[PDB]
Amino acid sequence: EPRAEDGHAHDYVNEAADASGHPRYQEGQLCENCAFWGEAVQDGWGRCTHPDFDEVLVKAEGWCSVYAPAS
Amino acid sequence: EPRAEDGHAHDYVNEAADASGHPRYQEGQLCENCAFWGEAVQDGWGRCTHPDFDEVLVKAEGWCSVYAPAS
Ligand code: SF4
Numbered sequence: 102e103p104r105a106e107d108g109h110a111h112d113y114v115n116e117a118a119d120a121s122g123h124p125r126y127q128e129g130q131l132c133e134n135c136a137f138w139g140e141a142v143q144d145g146w147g148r149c150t151h152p153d154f155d156e157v158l159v160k161a162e163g164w165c166s167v168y169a170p171a172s
Numbered sequence: 173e174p175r176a177e178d179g180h181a182h183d184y185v186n187e188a189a190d191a192s193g194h195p196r197y198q199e200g201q202l203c204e205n206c207a208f209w210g211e212a213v214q215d216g217w218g219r220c221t222h223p224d225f226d227e228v229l230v231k232a233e234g235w236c237s238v239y240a241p242a243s
C-alpha cells in the first residue's frame with residue numbers, strides 16, 4: 102500500500118516529534134508502541150489496525166491522535 | 173484530559189469568530205480572558221472552572237455562551 106502522508110487521519114505525522122504541540126501527545130508515543138500496530142512491512146513502514154488507516158502504510162516513528170498504549 | 177469539541181456545552185466553539193451569530197458574543201471575548209479560565213495546562217489549551225466543562229480541556233481562542241469577563 103501507498104505510504105501515509107502527514108495529516109492522513111487524526112493529525113497523522115511520519116515524525117512523531119512533529120505532533121509536539123498536541124495536547125494528547127506525550128514523549129515515547131510512536132506508531133511502533135501503539136496498540137494499533139499491525140506488523141512491520143518495509144523500511145520503517147508498517148500497518149495500523151485502526152480502521153482509519155486501512156489503505157495506507159504508516160511509519161514506525163510516526164504518531165496520530167488515536168494513539169493507545171500497547172498492552 | 174481530552175479536548176473539547178464544538179458544542180460541548182453552552183454553544184462552545186474552539187474558534188471564537190465562529191460564534192459571531194450569538195447574541196451574547198462580542199468581539200474580543202475569549203476563554204483566556206474569561207473569568208472561568210483556569211490557565212493553560214498544555215500549549216494553547218486550559219481548564220474551565222465551570223462545572224459544565226469539567227472533564228475537558230478548553231482552547232485559549234474558544235468561546236462559550238456562559239462567558240464572564242474577567243480582569
Ligand atoms: S493509531 Fe497508533 S499505530 Fe495507528 S497511526 Fe495512530 S499512532 Fe500510529
Ligand code: SF4
Nearest residue numbers: 203206208209220236
Ligand atoms: S466558561 Fe466558556 S468562555 Fe469561559 S473559559 Fe469556560 S469555555 Fe471558555
